[PDB]
């Protein structure tokens, strides 16, 4: 039983779901195993919506860091005196600060919109609520919290009028994800500023993870990553971003993280994973699509692509985190040790260990 | 039963009280409702003093942010090698860094001194202690912690000597708040550097919340605020101050704070308040003088002044916090959504909705 | 039963020990009393090794701040692409980023290597694990966590050849501290950069606490101290390091810390200690070598040196903390209070109190 493994059939809680989309919310990282207690302030949210759809405007008491896996979106954040629309593409990411009102459109005509966002609540540690402004068959708008009298006074209106317009106590929609006119979307999209190479380091607009050269890349996979060093949005959240692709039958050589807690999310494919932790203990698990395997800090682990494989990883506590490899040539730790220490470390000869390490000649991704 | 409402009668605990005033300590915010587990690191104190009294020198294991609600005071801070007296007036605010020995004088003849301070204990979370230097009838000087021999050694004297002067085991005051000589207050009161417009941004001297123009003001009320943006002393604790007048039968329009948890204390007047959380849930509560009400971030709330009303707000987690309103002209989100989305959100012609919003022609403070 | 006092003969727990030394791990600070809750994220590690010994390579999911109390060590950090050896002398401090893999060497022929290190665990709060690369009769190597297929696929070899070289399932050493050839230590000592007066403020190499002038130093004692202000490394951990010495029969004049929580580890000699908390409460404790006494912030406390003494102190919550002294000429707070308040503070004439406080002519360390 692998505590660092969250399947998908039956921890994701569906927050809303209709014929137009669904929003699921991963279970608390510490409700699973107290071993994950330093993640108690984090959640995973998965949003899927149909082509030509919107998410009705709303805010939450939590930062968000969202990542576009596939499809195309329009993320519009509304403020007290401004509005900002951003044209997200696959591999784009952006930060929705806490308390900001916003809506999500899927401007595509056939493709789906699969987004995953990392919630960081503000009031209750690892719990947060969703304030929908709109009054839908599926949710009351938070304006209906206020008394008639307050409402009449606040809006300068008889109740029958504010009710008949904003609330409606059928005239209202079915769900918080509704469908859009082509004509509508045609308007909504023509003022969305979009991700560019110039945004790698902007505290506002979205930056693309895969825009840059992958840190690691060879015939067996590619390792894209963005870190608080290069991105102010990720400096404040102090988290690192990385999305990495593995050719079926390759794998990511064993490695550990100096100081980062990593939340990987399986985007596509199948994969086997092996985590070790303390006389050592094997933490293996067989991950499929939409699964989540968390990898504590400084724990060595390996990723075996049992199919063509792409996943997203969130790196908690990522200021100056370093990746260390035990196999392969470049970034190998077990090959920087002084020889005499190598001798002393294992049962073998300085030259005998110098021989076994030099064997496997590739680095980062190697083939099964 | 509003877990965000702290009835002054049964939420305060007197700490030292007598003929010359009293000190009371608000209860832990988390012990009330676990919904407030992010304020567990904070406490509220009310210090009230009769005219021409002093608070005997002492210190705490908590950073203090004191706000003077009413009266005049001479705050003095004794360091290891320096002393710094300050002249506080109503509205003045200053920060007593933890473990700083300090005494409070009330130089007024007829007027009291009503202060309120936010406490951030350093040793236990939410719990702090007071180390009174004085040997009193209500408290032992903490020097009376040391054995006779260490004390003899430390001061270079006999014990009968050092007890007869500093401890006294009838010669010693009844409380930690004792009356003063005019001649004393004459002398104490002539070196206390006083607040001014050149102090809004000092690490050291206190700053006035109201020496600057409010951020909102109309005939029905005023909204004074200082943030970590303009203050170093606030930047550090990462808190905003705000002090707002609402005429009777006016109200603060329905709004929510993006990421700031607000601890508001009713200074003067009566008010009704309304909070919404999640199908929505009304959280009304009828505030009176000295009451406390807490408003989690991104929670919409409204404050209805049922008699001339002024209150004080401490905004916890206020780096880059935005106020959003839901009613009135200026700073209304609901009125910044793309219209076509307004069509989709409420059961009301985007035209029929543009009409309702525009109706209330005022902003921030409107009239019941 | 002083909760702030952790007796060494029964508050340590041994993690590894053999004929080549032993590693102890202090018990959890709050496990003892909830009163120390604010340290819960910290631990004390003690290490000591025979002459001519190496601590086999490992890493831990925790930052370490080690201090060389006594001996000469060669500290070698091994990165993915770099390697960094440091020649540590007594008084040298240096910081091991979590998940850094590193090995310790004791190059002396007769002397030891007594090192203590403060531990800040990443994943679980207050709990960490040592991941040892090395296949030893004591512990498995974490590469034995993985499974044969993955191990085979990783190194590009069969299993027998990888188990005969790195693991060995007789041929392997006995414990995680093994002895060295002189030839070995000789080669291995070739590039260990050593501390210097030009390291007092380097973010990398180790800095000596005593290489500067102390803050306090008369004929009865010395107070070496370094704050986050002067060291980038102590800044990131927000800590102060202070090595102080007290002659037999002198003491540290009673005093309290403004906002730092102090973890003092008794290094050499005996000492009587006394603490005061809250009606006051005496917390006296008779420390011996290797004991640990923790001092809540703004708790006044005196240290009596019953034999020739020296202790290391950790200053948690260090940024801008202030030592306030209750007796003595210099840094005495009680001698700063206005005279008229002094008159009002204690039962004694302003001149009768001015008199007692001028007696002790000396400052900080007096004689008993």
UniProtKB/Swiss-Prot annotation, chains A, B, C:
GO CC, alphabetical: aleurone grain; endoplasmic reticulum; protein storage vacuole
CDD domains found in the cross-reference section: cupin_7S_vicilin-like_C (cd02245), cupin_7S_vicilin-like_N (cd02244)
Glycosylation sites: 304
Boundaries of every Cupin type-1 domain copy: 4-163, 207-354
Subcellular locations according to the entry: Vacuole, Aleurone grain; Endoplasmic reticulum; Protein storage vacuole
UniProt xrefs under Pfam families: Cupin_1
UniProt keyword Protein biosynthesis present: no
Gene3D superfamilies with a match to the protein in the record: Jelly Rolls (2.60.120.10)
Main location: other
InterPro entries reported in the protein's UniProt record: Cupin_1, RmlC-like_jellyroll, RmlC_Cupin_sf, Seed_Storage-Functional
Keywords: Allergen, Endoplasmic reticulum, Glycoprotein, Signal, Vacuole
Protein purpose: Seed storage protein. Accumulates during seed development and is hydrolyzed after germination to provide a carbon and nitrogen source for the developing seedling.
Family: Belongs to the 7S seed storage protein family.
Complex formation: The alpha-, alpha'-, and beta-subunits associate in various combinations to form trimeric proteins.
Name of the protein: Beta-conglycinin beta subunit 2
Organism: Glycine max (Soybean)
Gene that this polypeptide is encoded by: CG-4
